[PDB]
A paper describes a structure:
The available crystal structures revealed eukaryotic UGPs to comprise a structurally conserved central catalytic domain with Rossmann-like α/β/α sandwich fold (reviewed in Kleczkowski et al.), flanked by a flexible N-terminal domain with low conservation at primary sequence level and regulatory function in S. cerevisiae, as well as a C-terminal β-helix domain171819. In the fungal and animal kingdom, the complexity of UGP function is further increased by their octameric organization, which was shown for human UGP (hUGP) to be essential for enzymatic activity.
We thereby resolved the [name]-Glc complexed conformation of the full-length hUGP isoform 1, which represents the first product-bound crystal structure of an octameric UGP, and thus enabled us to identify the binding mode of [name]-Glc and to discover an intermolecular mechanism - we termed it interlock - that stabilizes the sugar-binding region. The asymmetric unit of the crystal contained four hUGP1 molecules (chains A, B, C and D) which formed a non-crystallographic cyclic C4 tetramer. The bound [name]-Glc enabled the detailed analysis of the active site, which is located in a deep groove at the center of the catalytic domain (purple) and consists of a twisted eight-stranded β-sheet (white arrows) flanked by α-helices, a structural motif characteristic for nucleotide binding domains. Electron density analysis revealed the binding mode of the product [name]-Glc in the active site of hUGP1, where it is coordinated by the NB-loop, parts of the eight-stranded β-sheet and other residues of the catalytic domain. The phosphate groups of [name]-Glc are coordinated by the active site residues K127, H223 and N251. Compared to the apo-structure, the side chain of H223 is rotated by 90° in the [name]-Glc state and thus reaches a position which allows formation of an H-bond with the β-phosphate moiety. Movements of the N- and C-terminal domains toward the active site upon [name]-Glc binding (closing of the structure) resulted in a slightly more compact geometry with a deeper active site cleft. A more prominent rearrangement was observed in the SB-loop region, which undergoes a considerable tilt. R287 of the SB-loop of one subunit (A′, light green) forms H-bonds with D456 at the base of the C-terminal β-helix domain of the neighboring subunit (A, dark purple), to which it is connected side-by-side; likewise, R287 (A) interacts with D456 (A′).
Numbering used by the authors:
A (entry chain A), D (entry chain C): 24 to 508
B (entry chain D), C (entry chain A): 404 to 508
Write the structure that this text describes.
């Protein structure tokens, strides 16, 4: 049966293929090839699961603390190591979570600087001070490729070599019937709902086919540093780099991932285990529902994955050449506005850590993991709680306590326009610890938020926090409207 | 008399020279402010009224520390409702109304 | 101190070995809870607070038996209103407001 | 230890005794004796004292279906068989639950008729139609005796001989001390603080000591019919009486209780079993630890006790003068005015069934089990749903379905006073199945309720149902004030 399914899907896929402008046909074919392999693997095994008996906690030498690395000290010549590195940023996504139409990378983060501006500023400044020439590679998506290339012109005078390569594009496949939903139409058909970016993970296949890893490996590059464009913490670290290109005892690590300690918040997943001799990234979906609670337990697994990864180009080429590169199949289900239940197969770049030799984890501070998922984060990042230089944000020296406060703005704030609208100015959050804003709320200028502030406005009601307002350990509720006279 | 609107020296009150215009502002505090005890308790400190013209406050109203009142301010808390003006709040030419409670934590 | 967050022996309290994170959570019950009689009255049983981090209870609130409070729970009931958190209720990172009354049938 | 403490308590009770009424002095001790016996007995058996093994379901013909008795059931002569019977009603209860002090019997149930009025009416009409002389007897309490004897002047001209006897009153006992609560203030400090009725068991002890037992057995009475005045259903059944005084094969039954099938509501009562060769009434309390959940199971035990009993006076005398009457000690606890925690010992009349020869239950229809405990039951009984004839209520023949409808009135309706005030007339409930009313609700004249009706007036809100309103399968909520003009 299964074979008949596969072959039945694929020749239909061949039919889809027949539709193509020649412009981007051959590049379409590959993607289909890629998908199909994913699909061949998809039905190779079902109910993807791991033998919990064979799992183990990683050895203490397999996940080293960042302070030891930093202890060792930065490298003797920064230039010669920076020239062996290439920065890669994931740009597959857009600001729909933040209620913006365009690619996320473009949403303004601080003082008219967008995420991309910040990355560019970083690497540029890096080059300018160390008189080196680091590249920036942006892994775009079909949703962002074009929207993104348009604005790359701004960085002509800024001192960095920005590249680009499009992620794959796979057909969404119906849930009940394991067939593709595509009507053999191109991107322009408004059938964009029938396609998807497989994974942050296919980057191996996408980066190989782009031919940039051969350019770069030929250009004398040893390592790529992958991160997200929204993760403001993912700076290029000279200590980690030093531990990479000047390895002690000659241990070349092909694949090293930054992990960090778990808060009760971020239990989400992405914790390293020792499975069958090598490190493996284990996700909750992989764990049986019998040991799912034990997996979340912070005694047994203290850390999780920040998708800040340093990988060796060489190993990528070697492994991709052999299709030995191995990642679990994420079968993601979705139901979109059209009213259609579909699944879409994908993979996570981290999961491949099990196919590389001498794979390593390093437990970096949370400082290196500041994802800006939503507008509440934006509020942190814009406030005097943080300080920006050379496109790099660091916590304020004037922050009395080292922790990052907690801030949850409601649905009224979800869209950036609304967020900006509702804050006359960004309030003083230097002494802040907890902040909960729920209903319809507005903030005048020079508000000051200290400690635990819970402003709550009920449904229908609205709260206008007057300017100059100092809220320190207050819980403020009701319905107040301030009007002009 | 208690505000920075007047300066006190050797018992003698004189309207602050800093006052832009020699006119004395109009202020009407509601029933909840009639008794000196309530009044005192309801103003955590005497606000900045140096740029005040009209102040009308009616109902259950509370002032935090350092409030600044400028020009025309009307604060109307209806029956049953209360209004807690947070501290440092500067109100300039505004009518503020509704039901807002500010509790400690 | 009454919750399973803590363990008592020989008149000595120590934090539960089962507390996943070493910190003590934060809990602020309102004025309705201030008096011990009221506090005891309003908690049918002491809820599970082993996974709790922040807890803010403000207005008139009651808790049935076997409520479970995890992470950040902000229950808020407005003036006049009342909230009856039903028994067995699991509140994890929720902010719950309004006016709900549960009555016997 | 236990005995040493018992005698210590006995001394105290003697210290109690030395104070008493000259005229009512002596019997107090008789009551008191009963008390110690109870104390001795309750310490004699500490714990479950009953296994789970020896219990078995009653065999068929342990309990006979009422339908089988009513078959060719009416006696050829109804006078003679009625002349041998005496009707006893349990009147040791107040209407505090319905928000009145007076004995519950004195609360007006239908058309100004009280429970008593109904009973008196019934047997009076019996006497008047069958030219017989049936006695009525009330088991009173120290809470109802005087109050009942005051109003018994009413039935002077009504053709029925009404008698009265007061059950024992025992001193409450402290939970920790195991000594009499004994505030003895003196009784000026009220009894509830000071004394209690043993619940239903005493009936045998006090009915003997009253001399009415000897009176009636000597007057020519063979059987005694016990039930509650609040159980409107418990009428004198001539069929049961016929199967009783004219038994087949001349097998006389000394004790017979009416049981009925368990609805979902009545799964909390005690049930009939066969234990150690004889029928016995078993209680939840009697079933400690394991096997508890099964007792409730309607699959195992399908019937429960209506407390509508028929007993032989001869048997009662024979067994009482031998002290062979055995009932399972029941221990209950609470306190309020005292600000104490207190224990009181009592027994159950139904439990004694085991100490009788030829004990025989019968499964009567719910028609005979209609306990009016709340105003919600009054509304039900006062409505056209039931028809009244000579103190006897019978469900309307117009009622399409035999089932009784569910009605629940709110806290505003608990007190009969408020309840009466809130209904300008009893609405039509003949096509009613389900009625729920909550909050400040009022009903005009000639309202008609059909099917399911839910009326919710939230806190602060009032709902005035306008008169003549017909509500059928509606849920009405809101806030409506109907005023006069
Ligand atoms: O197929 C995709 C989807 C998204 N992106 C880009 O990467 C981000 C997607 O990641 P995010 O939405 O930030 O969360 P996750 O996909 O879980 O991936 C990373 O970011 C999370 C932030 O919480 C971390 O928790 C995860 O460990 C980390 O792998 C977006 O900003 C996109 O620009 C891609 O390159 N390819
Ligand atoms: Zn193209
Ligand atoms: Zn925008
Ligand atoms: Zn204060
Ligand atoms: Zn029979
Ligand atoms: Zn009774
Ligand atoms: Zn009469
Ligand atoms: Zn009343």
């Amino acid at each position: 049966i299964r074979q008949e399914l596969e072959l039945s899907v694929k020749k239909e896929l061949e039919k889809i293929l027949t539709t193509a402008s020649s412009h981007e046909f051959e590049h379409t074919k590959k993607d289909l090839d890629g998908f199909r392999k994913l699909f061949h693997r998809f039905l190779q095994e079902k109910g993807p699961s791991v033998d919990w008996g064979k799992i183990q906690r990683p050895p203490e030498d397999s996940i080293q603390p960042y302070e030891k690395i930093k202890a060792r000290g930065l490298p003797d010549n920064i230039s010669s190591v920076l020239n062996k590195l290439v920065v890669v940023k994931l740009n597959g996504g857009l600001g729909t979570s933040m209620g913006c139409k365009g690619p996320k990378s473009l949403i303004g983060v601080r003082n008219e600087n967008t995420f991309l501006d910040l990355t560019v500023q970083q690497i540029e400044h890096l080059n300018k001070t160390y008189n080196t020439d680091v590249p920036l590679v942006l892994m775009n998506s079909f949703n962002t490729d074009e929207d993104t290339k348009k604005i790359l012109q701004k960085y002509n005078h800024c001192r960095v070599k920005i590249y680009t390569f499009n992620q794959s594009r796979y057909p969404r496949i119906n849930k009940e019937s394991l067939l593709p939903v595509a009507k053999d139409v191109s991107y322009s058909g408004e059938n964009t709902e029938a396609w998807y970016p497989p994974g942050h993970g296919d980057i191996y296949a996408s980066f190989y086919n782009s031919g940039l890893l051969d350019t770069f490996i030929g250009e004398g590059k040893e390592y790529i540093f992958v991160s997200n464009i929204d993760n403001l913490g993912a700076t290029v670290d000279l200590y980690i780099l030093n531990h990479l290109m000047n390895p002690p005892n000659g241990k070349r690590c092909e694949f090293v991932m930054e992990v960090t300690n778990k808060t009760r918040a971020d239990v989400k997943g992405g914790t390293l285990t020792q499975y069958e001799g090598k490190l493996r990234l284990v996700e909750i979906a992989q764990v049986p529902k019998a040991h799912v609670d034990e997996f979340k337990s912070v005694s047994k697994f203290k850390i999780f994955n920040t998708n800040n990864l340093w990988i060796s180009l060489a190993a990528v080429k070697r492994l991709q050449e052999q299709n030995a590169i191995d990642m679990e199949i994420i079968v993601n289900a979705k139901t979109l506005d059209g009213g259609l239940n579909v699944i879409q197969l994908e993979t996570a770049v981290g999961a491949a850590i099990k196919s590389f030799e001498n794979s390593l984890g390093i437990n970096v501070p949370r400082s290196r993991f500041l994802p800006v998922k939503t507008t509440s984060d934006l509020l942190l990042v814009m406030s005097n709680l943080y300080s920006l230089n050379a496109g790099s944000l660091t916590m304020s020296e004037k922050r009395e306590f080292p922790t990052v406060p907690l801030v949850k703005l409601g649905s009224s704030f979800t869209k950036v326009q609304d967020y900006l609208r509702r804050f006359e100015s960004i309030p003083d959050m230097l002494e802040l610890d907890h902040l909960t804003v729920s209903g319809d709320v507005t903030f005048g200028k020079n508000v000051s938020l200290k400690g635990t502030v819970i402003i709550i406005a009920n449904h229908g009601d609205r709260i206008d926090i007057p300017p100059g307002a100092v809220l320190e350990n207050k819980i403020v509720s009701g319905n107040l409207r301030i009007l002009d006279h």
